[PDB]
From a paper:
CCs are quaternary structures comprising two or more α-helices supercoiled around each other with cyclic (Cn) or dihedral (Dn) symmetry. Here, we describe variants with all combinations of the aliphatic residues, Ile, Leu and Val, at a and d to give four classes of peptide: the ββ class, with a and d = Ile or Val; Lβ, a = Leu and d = Ile or Val; βL, a = Ile or Val and d = Leu; and LL, a = d = Leu. Peptides are named systematically appending the one-letter code for the amino acids at the a and d sites to “CC-Type2-“; e.g., CC-Hept becomes CC-Type2-LI. In summary, solution-phase data and X-ray crystal structures demonstrate conclusively that different classes of Type-2 coiled-coil (CC) peptides—i.e., based on abcdefg repeats with predominantly hydrophobic residues at a, d, e and g—adopt a range of distinct states.
Extending the sp2 hybridisation with Leu→Phe mutations gave CC-Type2-FI, which, by X-ray crystallography, formed a 6-helix collapsed structure similar to CC-Type2-LL. Thus, the additional bulk and hydrophobicity of Phe overrides d = Ile and drives collapse of a consolidated core. However, the large Phe residues are accommodated through a half-heptad translation along the superhelical axis between the two helical sheets, resulting in 21 screw symmetry. Despite the complexity of these Phe-containing structures, they are CCs founded on KIH packing. Moreover, the KIH analysis revealed that helices with the same sequence participate in different quaternary arrangements. Similarly, the sequences with bulky Phe at a or d fit poorly to most structures other than their own.
Numbering used by the authors:
A (entry chain A), B (entry chain B), C (entry chain C), D (entry chain D), E (entry chain E), F (entry chain F): 1 to 30
The structure:
Amino acid sequence: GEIAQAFKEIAKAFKEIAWAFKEIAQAFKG
Amino acid sequence: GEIAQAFKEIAKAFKEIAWAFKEIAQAFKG
Amino acid sequence: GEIAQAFKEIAKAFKEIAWAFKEIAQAFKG
Amino acid sequence: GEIAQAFKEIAKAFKEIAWAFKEIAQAFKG
Amino acid sequence: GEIAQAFKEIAKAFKEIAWAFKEIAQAFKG
Amino acid sequence: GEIAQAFKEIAKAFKEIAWAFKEIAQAFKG
């Protein structure tokens, strides 16, 4: 289904956003 | 229908947010 | 109905967010 | 329902994070 | 009910991330 | 299913992020 595919893409983007947030936090902490 | 179309547009925006986040994280690495 | 309308409004909100973070990614170039 | 409500709350928080990112990037340039 | 629960937890965390970014932006303004 | 598991993982990652930026925000005060 198109909706199921969109959810998969949204999950993948959330994980990429999470990883970028963690890199930014490391930049401020260091 | 219209619900599937809205989810495709949500997914598109999420992909663009994830890309921007990766760009921002890369700027904090120089 | 209003289920469709809710996801349509979510699509608009995240398009606004995508615009915002594209501008932030550009602002870090300067 | 509950998923749409959570998307809306996430969108509102993203917008506040975007505004703060803008002020931070602007600070780095004067 | 798992996906709705996960979305509620994501929304909770985003509210807290937003609070922190607003504090950080205020620090850069003073 | 799998998509529920993906969002459960995302929830755990963003709670870690909220924790990280709580510390960063309070470090910007002294």
